[PDB]
Amino acid sequence: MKICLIDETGAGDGALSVLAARWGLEHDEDNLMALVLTPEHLELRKRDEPKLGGIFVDFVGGAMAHRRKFGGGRGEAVAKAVGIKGDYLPDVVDATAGLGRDAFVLASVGCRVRMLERNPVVAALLDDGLARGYADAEIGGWLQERLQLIHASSLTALTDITPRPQVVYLDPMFPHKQKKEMRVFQSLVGPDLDADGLLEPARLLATKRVVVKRPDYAPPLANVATPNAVVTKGHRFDIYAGTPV
Ligand SMILES: Nc1ncnc2c1ncn2[C@@H]1O[C@H](CSCC[C@H](N)C(=O)O)[C@@H](O)[C@H]1O
Q1: CB atoms inside a 10 Å sphere around CB 190
Q2: Is the same domain home to 236 and 211?
Q3: Which residues contact 60 (CB under 8 A, 6 or more apart)?
Q4: Which domain holds residue 109?
Q5: What is the largest CA-CA distance in the chain?
Q6: Is ligand 1 within 6 A of the CB of residue 102?
Q7: Any idea what the CATH number is for the domain that residue 61 is in?
Q8: Is 101 annotated among the ligand-binding residues?
Q9: Is the dihedral of CA 110, 171, 127, 23 positive or negative?
Q10: Nearest-CA neighbor of 2 among 25, 20, 30?
Q11: Structural domain tally of the chain?
Q12: Which residues is 231 bridged to in the sheet?
């Protein structure tokens, strides 16, 4: 995948070159997007709009830490959609990791989560955040145990997932027509054209449920209607049945 690779570490140890090789990234000097390795973290920038700043995955601070403390945890809309209740903490597979925001919430409540991400740049950003997260003296311990990243496509990797999770969470990038962070991220990640193909394999893998995030008025994934869903402001979480063992 092409992208402008920028080194702002001053180390000269080849960290960026190793990272590009590992994720199969190709340097593109005139690319609209830039992946920058800084002394603090790996971030993504929209070169034509510096005012938007850079975005990076941070499980320890910022917005994720604020949501963990004030979001409600088991009380979150996504947590109730996955079925979290009482001492029931299902194993979850987030087939569309992205920035890992929803994944982190579920793992923070107590769920064991496996994240899948096929975009090499996104995966690189998540892996850097995970490295910093695992290193945290406070959450590093449980984070490493309840949140793992898998670089693969859920369209074909979901089938052979073992052990089978009770729930599969789906939030592919929808073709939005209607903040800074989102503008930068969406400039990289366009609509996932083959998203409708995730429902079938997801319902076969999950033993209990499949949750699909959908914005208001957006059609259900794969046009498969469902009577169950958690509704919040702006979006809803469609709930489907899985395939019991
Ligand atoms: N088959 C697939 N396998 C892995 N990742 C996939 C995928 N189809 C789409 N994706 C990823 O799914 C992500 C959805 S973006 C949503 C991010 C997430 N809801 C959050 O909490 O932030 C995108 O980054 C896209 O690259």
Answers
A1: 10
A2: yes
A3: 132, 133, 136, 138, 139
A4: 57-245
A5: 56
A6: yes
A7: 3.40.50.150
A8: yes
A9: positive
A10: 25
A11: 2
A12: 236
